[PDB]
A paper describes a structure:
Of all the constructs, only SM2-ΔN14 crystallized and the crystals diffracted only to 7 Å resolution. The Matthews coefficient suggested 6 subunits in the asymmetric unit (ASU) of the I4 cell. In spite of the low resolution data, the self-rotation function exhibited clear peaks and showed the presence of threefold non-crystallographic symmetry and additional twofold and fourfold non-crystallographic symmetries. These peaks indicated that SM2-ΔN14 has 432 symmetry. Despite the data being limited to a resolution of 7 Å, the electron density map calculated after the MR solution showed clear and well-defined density for individual subunits and for the β-sheets within the subunits. The ACD has an immunoglobulin-like fold, with two β-sheets comprising eight β-strands (β2–β9) connected by turns and loops. The electron density is absent for the first 43 residues in all the chains, indicating disorder in this region. SM2 has a long C-terminus with 31 residues, out of which only 14 residues had visible density in 5 chains and only 7 residues were visible in the 6th chain. However, the positioning of the dimers indicates that the C-terminal regions are poised to form hydrophobic interactions with the β4–β8 cleft of the neighbouring dimers. Judging by the proximity of the clefts to the neighbouring C-termini, it is clear that a network of dimer–dimer interactions similar to those in the reported 24-mers of non-metazoan sHSPs, is formed; holding the entire 24-mer together. In the case of SM2-ΔN14, the interior surface is hydrophobic and the exterior surface comprises both positively- and negatively-charged amino acids as observed in other cage-like structures of small sHSPs.
Small heat shock proteins (sHSPs) prevent the aggregation of cellular proteins during heat and other types of stress. Each subunit of the dimeric building block of sHSPs contains a conserved α-crystalline domain (ACD) flanked by a variable N-terminal arm and a short C-terminal extension. sHSPs from the cyanophage S-ShM2 (HspSP-ShM2) and its bacterial host Synechococcus sp. WH7803 were characterized by Bourrelle-Langlois et al.. The crystallographic and EM studies show that SM2 is capable of forming various types of oligomers, which vary in size and symmetry.
Numbering used by the authors:
A (entry chain A), B (entry chain A), K (entry chain A), O (entry chain A): 44 to 149
C (entry chain B), F (entry chain B), L (entry chain B), P (entry chain B): 45 to 102, 108 to 141
D (entry chain D), M (entry chain D), Q (entry chain D), S (entry chain D): 44 to 82, 87 to 105, 109 to 149
E (entry chain C), N (entry chain C), R (entry chain C), T (entry chain C): 44 to 75, 78 to 102, 105 to 149
G (entry chain F), J (entry chain F): 46 to 142
H (entry chain E), I (entry chain E): 44 to 108, 113 to 149
The structure:
């Protein structure tokens, strides 16, 4: 029921999002960033009807959806690459300055 | 059982609250703001009794209620408009300065 | 259905109080049909808020009159309908 | 298996009965008004070979509200559409007052 | 509720269909690879309400039946809200009603 | 299995639209066998992301053709397969 | 009713049948469109006084029995004897035997 | 389930029996009268040894399956797999069917 | 459960009874004929008093357990724990096994 | 079939057995690898006309009965009388009695 | 099973805690404040035994318990009043400087 | 009901210990009736905190005495009632 | 208890039947092609003492797709491997066009 | 699905085993403290797909049976996909088929 | 199913972690600190197979696991002591400057 | 019970590997009894951490030996017990 | 169906029995004190026509605590109110000591 | 627990009601569109406790019965805690107790 | 209802049977060693009046591990305490090596 | 598991108790308002382990029985792990074993 999303966890600073949008034109698609909370909003602005001129079973269903995720501040965007009905968005932020992993006592 | 409330989500900065208070006088009603946590408190200060002089079925029930919601800081108020037993409260705050939604790579 | 309260002031008087919130004066048209009152509430606007922004949220009525009704007052105040009806004289 | 009946008020003076009767001719059907209540002359030996299975097969009362009368009955496209007319309640008055 | 329907079985060459369509005009209704389709499609009819008209005991319907080849149509008669369609085809050279000995 | 939509343009034409996301041109090889179309999707890479970093996440098809098919157009655009087939002439 | 089946050969199907009491005018057989229909229709009935008649086990009824044949099945002989129907059919020539 | 037999009750004295034995030769069948008790024995002398592959269905098949004094037998007519046995006996010297009053 | 007895049915007149009494001495067993009703009584005179520890299983054990006129007895042969009782009586003057027609 | 058991002493096990009708050629006993097998195999059968025979209670059947003995059990006597088998075994010498 | 605690909500700045400790000496009782997270720890340091010299049913049971609550910073203490086996602790903090509750438009 | 503990010091002595938290000296009045002790706890204030602010939160007793009782000490300390009773001499 | 059968298409012109028949010799087994459908001569009185329990014990049809033919049958290691060959559908053409 | 297997019981000295291994080559198969192990271990065989070959009705198996000491092997015969292993050992000095009196 | 971990709660400033890693070489083990969120990642880099030369039942199972815990900032490390297949990690941070536990009124 | 793994190096050798975490050298004492090995693990300290601070958290074994055992090596390394046993020569 | 009884202690010397007896006259009712335990003279043939359904229809013991006595019995408004008086336990003493 | 009540059915003109009100004073009780209402309303009575008085086996009640028009009241009698109300009205000109032939 | 038995190994050479036998004298009880397995002489007519209900009422085998022997049997306080002694397994050797 | 116990009922004056205490020394055991208490309280005994000694089929117990007044004790005998306590009191002046007429 959830459209088929995937989240790819690169480094300490970088998290990529992988997206299955097949048939979606770029005029339909709209992303939004409100207070470091990402809203991706697919909206069919042409609103293709469900006519029965001679149309059969439609298993794949698509019109208008909305999603939200509170990100840890202060997320920026790196790249977005539209390639064969998939979106690979690259978000790149986090500066803790404490990634040390070496201590021993025997 | 919850009195019939509605929350209306305007912009990135603005969130409106819609309120069904029918029969409530303004002396009864009391709102409260403690540490950016909104408490709306309807209190019947006249305390209308349930007499049986000749009174029948009372499906609509009303005396004293209390509600709470932790808002993200630093919420202020814009307008409140009492019009035919409804309250439309306009809250207007949020300054992220990162609402950019355009990046591509092919 | 909206939520209805009923009261007798006396045997003369029935008083109905009604929570209709958001309803406007053109949206409500009442009718009297066959010794039966019909309070109809019809939205004269296709209530469509912009789906993009707002989505997520949480009629006709008939009642027989017991000859012979005399309608008093009907007040549209603070989202309430307060109707005052009158009927007795049973001669007995 | 009774036919399917649909009843409606046009207004205060307009009942309307619409009725699906398929295959019914003009001498089989008979209506009667009895006590303020509205209410196959030759049948056939069906041949088994030709009549393997019919998927269709071919009295109904409704006590009237004082005091119903008739307007127009009309056979069209296998339906039955009966107009009935009655009112006088001496009460069709709408009243409202106050801000 | 799909409507209800009778099938008469005259000969081996002829199969007649009896369809129950009451209130249907003859521009709504449309008949059409050795497969028959009887489609009823409201072109110009009334939309219902909940105020004046309410309770009932009629929209658009389509039907399919894969017949053996190569069926033609004969005569369609619209009377008493009934469609009586005649279909006439088949010569299998095998309709032999026989065989008896002692 | 991927999710399949089916449409008749006319009786002539069947049009199939297909969501294959991430699939590449070498990964898809189609075949025609015994008046039956087989659309096979085989990963030509052992899809192994570095387990260390990425783990947690959320075929062949056969359909009989009704003599005699004429394949039109097949477009690999924006993660969709849009195939246009043709078959009628029943002489009747 | 109770039926039994035999393949003499690839050529031959034989159907054996128990019809007890059935008269020769009642029985009919049709070979319509490569589909056999063995009909058994009593023409009329017998005067049955429910007074002294008891627990009637034999439900006397008409029946039509259809079977879609493998193109294209033919009849050979039918012999009515000992209250049995022995029907001989004949078809093959599949060039695969 | 057993074979479907019918008993006709002609008179007080006479009882007729209708047996359904289809495809039974007359040397398999035998009837016995012992101690004023009848026994109708269907006894296959040898079962027709046949293959179970060519004969797809063998649901219905053929295998092997006290009166008031002083019973005699009238007739037994075997034709077209139906047995009709006529029995005629009973004398109580009391078969008067009369008496009526007000 | 009771002892496993078998009744052989020789003729209408003659009936034979086969009783299974293993390990039963002949003074325990007794047979009685009373009012044209037989009674075969197995009666242990004293039970062999034995210990229940050394004898692990005592599942199967030994304890204590209307004809048509005018029955007589023919023979009763006791050997290797099997009783074979020959009874021979029945005369209805009606044992004819004949009658056949077309 | 119905079996009974006895320990006369530490030396002695005795098995008492009801075999009714069994003939002397049918019965066999084997002492194989410190495991006793008392066999009861009817050599052939009897002509059984199902006509007048009724409710056969005695299911006549062949049976082989094995029991793993405590090393190392021996036979003493077997006496066939009154349709009983009385088998005497003898072993002890455990230096613990 | 929870010992019988009560929380009393005075003002926007003040929240009182009411406590049922009957028989508890003050040497036993120990409170703790770690990063504005209150830990009250009752510990029977005498560890009264359960002897059976002639002792009957003991429905009231008491030895060692521990509790925790993350408070909003930077909680301080006001008073604590030991009076008849009850503790009334007064915590007093919160400075939002936004408690305004009056806006209208008609 | 409040929670009650029971102890014998000896056969002479019963000692009852009682958790009554918030209870005051006027709120508790004890009675002796028919060789039966009745410890009654009655609120002499209608305990009504201001609903506006505070709402959400989480009797009589009779026991027969086994002739002849001698009441010792009863201490109201730190929300406890510690009563010391005395009864033996069975002459045997 | 029938034996276990496995059917496979090598290609468009290659069916392949593989068959487990253990203990089966070369005169017991008989195959037949009947109506476009592919389909123990002396048994033994097993001695009870030696044959306490066997844990193995020793007709099957499949209507063919017009119009199957035979290639090579081979007994090896107690299996049966039958090659069958047939095609001509007049249709083995792959077609695709567009960006 | 473990494969299926017969055990023949010649004498008290000899016990023959019959194993069902069809399609197994004689380098895969391997036989080996008075406990027999018949291991079948695929050394060089085909791996399956889901495209050309699909449905079936054969991997690696191992078996253990604690025999009384001190078993040796006699002859193993690989024919018709059957292994017939002969094992020949045992002299218990107790195979006495006797004892009868009156 | 969770490998057998234990958490030891020293002071207000110090929390120790106790770890059951038996058979794990130090080349396999890898810890990670991303934005004060500890990820301990055991990865068998030799990838010991499950051969059947003569190997029996293996109840103890070990290959690759990963764990995560969001710590309150700004966690540092104190000691780590590898001693008989156990790891005792000492984390030491928290400066509230409000640990006072003494107030009375009678 | 602690979790036990079992391996044959050959028929000669059994090798047992054992997760005993926190266990010390005085806490483990092994015994051989009646051709049966008993690995006993007894805490020589009453493991009592200060309840005040730490509370919340998440034996003997016998196995018969198959004459005649020869114990090889037993290594207490990194919280593992790796025992190497030896037994074959069946003369057959 | 017994009547409904309510028992009460006024004090240590005051039991009080209150009793609903509707339609009961002054010669039907009889009370008795037996063994330290407190415990329709002419009935009618009701006529079916007039007496379609009555929705009402018209011995009880309680062992007394040594040693109960009587005070005042009073018929008023169809009830029965019996005052009983007894005490002397030689023990009505309240005692308490300590801070 | 609603109280319990008897209805006596004198004539077709007269219907008498018998109400069970024990302990009720005559200022509490009140009787009143061709619909009778018998209301019992505590005006001056005692409120209960849980200390002195406890267990029981009496508050305020109201009753409605739509009678055919145009009922009047006759006499109400308060005795033995029973209310006996007399109502007397009805002339339907149809109380004919007849009709018999042969 | 058998008595209650408790078995224990003191060491490798020390079994110990402890046994509750209440009311049992010294001539009723008999023990026997049979085939490497360890295993009321005059009863009374109890009088019903005096013996209303007794709340107590008054052979057991255990195959021994080659080859058990006896030490000391002792009646004390209604119990039975049997010491048994046996070992020689030719194997009581503990061995361990490595860091 | 509470231990098990017999009660003997000599006369109306005398009731003897038989207690089952095996392994109990006479300093552990202690007997004591016309209510008898037989308390068994381990003073000096062994604590169990799980290594040497394990399975069983004995701690501290107390018992109470409200006897009619004013019971005294007679004799307590500790033999075969049984306590046989004698209690002797009661004169009700009513033990009359009589009353018969015709």
């Amino acid at each position: 029921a959830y459209p088929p999303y995937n989240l790819v966890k690169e480094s300490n600073v970088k998290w990529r999002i992988e997206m299955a949008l097949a048939g979606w034109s770029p005029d339909a698609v709209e992303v939004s960033t409100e207070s470091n909370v990402l809203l991706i909003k697919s909206k069919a602005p042409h609103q293709h009807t469900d006519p029965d001129h001679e149309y059969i079973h439609r298993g794949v269903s698509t019109r208008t959806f909305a999603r939200g995720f509170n990100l840890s501040d202060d997320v920026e965007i790196g790249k977005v690459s539209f390639q064969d009905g998939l979106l690979v968005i690259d978000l790149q932020k986090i500066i803790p300055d404490h990634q040390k992993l070496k201590v021993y006592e025997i």
